[PDB]
C-alpha cells in the first residue's frame, strides 16, 4: 500500500508540474491572443465604416440583407478548440449550440452543422449529427486565411447546392480575463440598421457586393481570434484548477503515506516484541 | 488435510480427484490461533514460521502420479481471499509460489460485467497448453497474452486520439474477445463449444 501511495505521489507531482507549465504557457498565449484581437480592430472598424457608407449608397437588395421567404435550413458555425485541457470551453460552446438548435427547431428551421475544432466534431459525432464541412488545427492560433475559407464556405452555402436560408456563428466571447461567454450571432441575413448622421468606384452596388463577403470574412476572423483568446483563458483557468487539485492530492497522498509508514513501523515493532516476549 | 487424505486414497488407487480448499486463508488463521495458544513465537503478520509449510505440505500432495503408481491424479483449486485487492500480501504470495497458476478474480473487473472476473494480466497457468486439448491449444494458444496487451493498450489509449489503424483493430479484437469470455453462473460449456467460441 505504501508503494502505491508513493507512486501516486510521484505521479501527482509530475502532473502538477505539467499543469503549472501549461498554466504559464496559457498566460503567455492569452496576452498574445488578446494583442492579436486588438491588432485586427482597426481593419474591422474601417471596413465597417465604409460598408455603412456603401449601404447608405447601396440598394440594400443583396441576398445577405434579405430573409428567405420560407426559411428551412440554418447553418451553424460552432467554433471550438482543437485540443483539450480547456475546462468548460468546449462544453459551454456546445451547450450554447444546442440552445441555438432548440431555438431554431421551435421556430421551424432545420440546423445544419459547420464546425471548427476537433472537440466539437467529437461531440457531434457521438450524438449522430452530421457536419457538412469542418476545419481544424487553427483554434490555438488562427490566421486570416482560415477565416477567409470559412467565410467563403458559409457565404456560398447561403447563396445556394442544398444551401441554407440562414446562418449563425456560435463562439466564445472573450469579455475579460475572468469571464468568457458562449454567444451566437446571426451572421446572415444581416439586419439593415438605420441610424442618424461620398464617391464610389466602379459603382456603389458592385463595390458593396464585393465588400459584404469581405466584411463577413473579417467578422468571422474576429470571432476566431476571440475564440482563441477565450480558449487560452479557459486553459489557464482549468490548468490552475488542475494544479491546485494536484497539490491537494499530493497533500492527501503524503498524509496517507505517512500514516502507512507509521503503521508499518508500529506493526514491525509489534511483531518483533511479540517474538521477544515469547522468548 | 482430511480432504487431501480422502482424495489421496483415491489418487493412489488410480482415480482422478479434484480438491477445492475454500478458503486456505482461514486455515492459516486457524493455525495462527493454534500456534499462539501453544505459545509459539509468531513470525510476520503474527503468523507462525511454518505457515508456508502448512500450505506446501498440503498443496504439494496434489500430483499426477506416474503409470507405475497407478496413473491417478489430484487437482487442487485452493481459494484465497485477498485483503483490499492486494495479491502481493504474505499468504497470497506464499500460496501463489506453491501453486501452478493463478485465477485472480478482481472485483473491478467483476463490477465492469467481466464475469468470471479473471484478471488476464496477473492470471497464468504454468501448465499452459499441455493441459488443453489440441484444438483448444491451436485456437487459443496466444489468447492470454493478446488479452493482456489489449488491457495494456486500453489503459494507454483511453485518452488518445491519434490511434493507428492497427491499434484500433487490436482494441476492437480485444473488446470482442472480452465479451466472448463473459459467462453467466451455472452455464458450463463443453470443450467443443468452448473451442468453437474462441475460434
Amino acid at each position: 500500500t505504501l508503494r502505491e501511495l508513493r507512486g501516486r505521489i510521484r505521479s501527482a507531482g509530475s502532473i502538477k508540474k505539467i499543469t503549472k507549465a501549461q498554466e504559464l504557457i496559457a498566460t503567455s498565449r492569452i496576452a498574445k491572443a488578446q494583442a492579436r484581437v486588438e491588432a485586427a480592430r482597426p481593419y474591422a472598424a474601417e471596413i465597417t465604416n465604409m460598408l455603412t457608407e456603401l449601404a447608405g449608397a447601396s440598394a440594400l437588395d443583396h441576398p445577405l440583407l434579405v430573409e428567405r421567404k420560407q426559411p428551412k435550413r440554418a447553418g451553424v458555425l460552432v467554433v471550438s478548440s482543437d485540443r483539450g485541457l480547456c475546462g468548460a470551453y468546449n462544453a459551454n460552446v456546445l451547450r450554447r449550440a444546442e440552445e441555438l438548435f432548440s431555438l431554431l427547431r421551435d421556430e421551424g428551421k432545420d440546423p445544419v452543422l459547420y464546425v471548427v475544432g476537433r472537440k466539437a466534431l467529437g461531440y457531434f459525432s457521438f450524438r449522430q449529427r452530421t457536419v457538412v464541412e469542418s476545419w481544424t488545427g487553427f483554434s490555438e492560433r488562427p490566421t486570416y486565411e482560415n477565416a477567409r475559407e470559412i467565410a467563403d464556405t458559409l457565404v456560398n452555402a447561403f447563396m445556394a447546392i442544398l444551401g441554407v436560408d440562414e446562418l449563425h456563428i456560435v463562439f466564445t466571447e472573450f469579455r475579460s480575463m475572468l469571464s468568457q461567454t458562449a454567444v451566437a450571432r446571426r451572421a446572415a441575413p444581416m439586419e439593415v440598421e438605420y441610424v442618424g448622421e461620398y464617391s464610389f468606384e466602379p459603382d456603389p452596388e458592385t463595390l458593396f457586393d464585393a465588400l459584404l463577403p469581405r466584411y463577413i470574412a473579417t467578422r468571422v476572423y474576429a470571432a476566431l481570434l476571440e475564440a482563441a483568446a477565450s480558449e487560452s483563458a479557459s486553459r489557464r483557468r482549468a490548468m490552475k484548477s488542475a494544479t491546485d487539485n494536484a497539490d491537494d492530492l499530493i497533500k492527501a497522498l503524503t498524509l496517507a503515506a505517512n500514516r502507512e509508514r507509521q503503521a508499518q513501523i508500529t506493526q514491525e515493532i509489534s511483531e518483533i516484541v511479540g517474538g521477544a516476549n515469547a522468548l | 488435510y482430511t480432504g487431501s487424505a480422502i482424495g489421496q486414497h483415491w489418487m493412489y488407487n488410480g482415480k482422478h480427484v479434484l480438491i477445492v480448499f475454500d478458503d486456505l486463508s482461514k486455515q492459516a488463521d486457524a493455525y495462527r490461533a493454534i500456534s499462539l495458544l501453544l505459545r509459539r513465537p509468531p513470525g510476520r503478520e503474527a503468523f507462525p514460521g511454518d505457515v508456508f509449510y502448512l500450505h506446501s505440505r498440503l498443496l504439494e500432495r496434489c500430483a499426477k502420479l506416474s503409470d507405475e503408481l497407478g496413473g491417478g491424479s489430484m487437482t487442487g483449486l485452493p481459494i484465497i481471499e485477498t485483503k483490499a485487492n492486494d495479491i502481493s500480501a504474505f499468504i497470497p504470495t506464499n500460496v501463489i509460489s506453491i501453486t501452478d497458476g493463478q485465477c485472480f478474480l478482481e472485483s473491478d473487473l467483476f463490477n465492469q460485467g467481466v464475469r468470471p472476473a479473471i484478471n488476464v494480466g496477473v492470471s497464468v497457468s504454468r501448465v499452459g497448453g499441455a493441459a488443453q486439448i489440441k484444438a483448444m491449444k491451436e485456437v487459443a494458444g496466444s489468447l492470454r497474452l493478446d488479452l493482456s496487451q489489449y488491457r495494456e493498450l486500453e489503459a494507454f489509449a483511453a485518452f488518445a486520439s491519434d490511434l493507428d489503424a492497427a491499434s484500433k483493430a487490436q482494441l476492437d479484437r480485444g473488446a470482442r474477445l472480452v465479451e466472448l469470455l463473459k459467462q453467466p453462473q451455472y452455464s458450463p460449456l463443453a470443450v467443443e463449444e468452448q473451442v468453437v467460441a474462441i475460434f
Binding site: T52, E53, A55, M190, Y194, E197 | -
Partner: peptide, 29 residues
Amino acid sequence: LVSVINEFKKGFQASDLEKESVKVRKPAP
C-alpha cells in the same frame, strides 16, 4: 465451421441570439 459461421452471419440480426447588422448611416429608409 467457417462456412457455417458465414451462413449464420447472413441470417443474424444485429441489435444496431445576437443579430449582425449594417448601419445605413441614415435615420430612415
